[PDB]
Design an enzyme around this catalytic site. Structure first.
Site, short mmCIF file in Angstrom:
data_model
loop_
_atom_site.label_atom_id
_atom_site.label_comp_id
_atom_site.label_asym_id
_atom_site.label_seq_id
_atom_site.Cartn_x
_atom_site.Cartn_y
_atom_site.Cartn_z
NE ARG A 99 -55.07 -17.27 -0.58
CZ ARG A 99 -54.57 -16.79 0.56
NH1 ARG A 99 -53.27 -16.61 0.79
NH2 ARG A 99 -55.45 -16.48 1.51
CB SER A 124 -49.68 -15.01 1.10
OG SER A 124 -49.62 -13.86 1.95
CD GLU A 173 -45.55 -14.70 1.56
OE1 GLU A 173 -44.75 -14.98 2.46
OE2 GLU A 173 -46.67 -14.17 1.77
O1 LIG Z 1 -52.96 -16.12 3.68
C1 LIG Z 1 -52.42 -16.93 4.51
O2 LIG Z 1 -53.11 -17.40 5.46
C2 LIG Z 1 -50.96 -17.34 4.34
C3 LIG Z 1 -50.78 -18.27 3.13
N1 LIG Z 1 -51.83 -18.97 2.79
N2 LIG Z 1 -51.70 -19.80 1.69
C4 LIG Z 1 -50.60 -20.00 0.99
O3 LIG Z 1 -50.60 -20.81 0.07
C5 LIG Z 1 -49.41 -19.25 1.38
C6 LIG Z 1 -48.23 -19.40 0.70
C7 LIG Z 1 -47.09 -18.73 1.06
C8 LIG Z 1 -47.14 -17.87 2.15
C9 LIG Z 1 -48.34 -17.70 2.84
C10 LIG Z 1 -49.50 -18.40 2.47
#
Ligand SMILES: O=C(O)Cc1n[nH]c(=O)c2ccccc12
EC number: 2.4.2.31
Length: 222
Positions: A99, A124, A173
């Site tokens: 993330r 996410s 995801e």
């Molecule tokens: O929370 C968010 O702003 C979306 C998000 N943030 N960071 C991630 O690594 C990521 C990966 C896959 C799909 C959404 C995300």
């Protein structure tokens, strides 16, 4: 090389796209008996979560006072309830995920191994570090200094793949319901970047440590 899976140059588009397609295929092939109870509204809600739905849902979950949302709050509560219901009908993922985000420097300077981070919004993650890093590139205006943080997440509970329903976004995801807790197992602060290894933990199992809200930086009471 701690965190080199994150630091290292990205794989090719061809490989990352293939891995994301394989993960989508695996997700669909792993649907269990609980999936037979998924509804049309749940599929609609999950399929558009990654492009736009998460933006409203996560703002509602981070809001200081949700009575200020008016009628939109009723819609947001319905959407959040629907996504949470859908998640429990989708396959679990366990393993490593990633993330990318931005965190207050004032919180980062306090963090130690064994501390627990609480995400008030949905969490996410991607199984692909290339995808996670895409969310570490820019941030909206902030009066408090924010720093780039790349998490390496060991998932042993809580995470469900939404990649089987995300036809319109190939991000490999894995999603967590709101209020997910993550225990820090390792921290590296290097060249203006911060890398944090965390492991999923059940909130009721957290004992004799310090919890922090990852968004606000505030301590969360035991
Ligand atoms: O929370 C968010 O702003 C979306 C998000 N943030 N960071 C991630 O690594 C990521 C990966 C896959 C799909 C959404 C995300």
């Amino acid at each position: 090389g701690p965190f080199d899976a994150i630091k290292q140059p990205n794989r090719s588009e061809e490989e990352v796209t293939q891995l994301a397609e394989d993960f989508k295929d695996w997700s669909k092939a792993s649907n269990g008996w609980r999936y037979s109870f998924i509804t049309a509204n749940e599929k609609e809600a999950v399929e558009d979560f990654s492009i736009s739905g998460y933006q409203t849902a996560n703002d509602y979950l981070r809001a200081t006072d949700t009575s200020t949302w008016g009628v939109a709050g009723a819609d947001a509560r319905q959407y959040i309830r629907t996504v949470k219901s859908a998640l429990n009908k989708l396959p679990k993922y366990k393993g490593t995920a990633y993330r990318g985000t931005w965190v207050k420097l004032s919180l980062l300077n306090k963090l130690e191994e064994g501390d627990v981070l609480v995400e008030p919004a949905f969490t996410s993650t991607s199984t692909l570090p290339e995808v996670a890093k895409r969310f570490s590139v820019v941030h909206p205006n902030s009066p408090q200094r924010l720093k780039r943080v790349l998490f390496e997440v060991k998932i042993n509970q809580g995470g469900h793949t939404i990649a089987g329903l995300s036809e319109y976004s190939k991000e490999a995801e894995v999603l967590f319901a709101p209020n997910a807790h993550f225990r820090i197992t390792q921290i590296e602060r290097t060249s203006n970047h911060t890398y944090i290894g965390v492991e999923t933990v059940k909130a009721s199992a957290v004992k004799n440590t310090q919890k922090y809200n990852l968004y606000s930086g505030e301590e969360v009471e035991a």
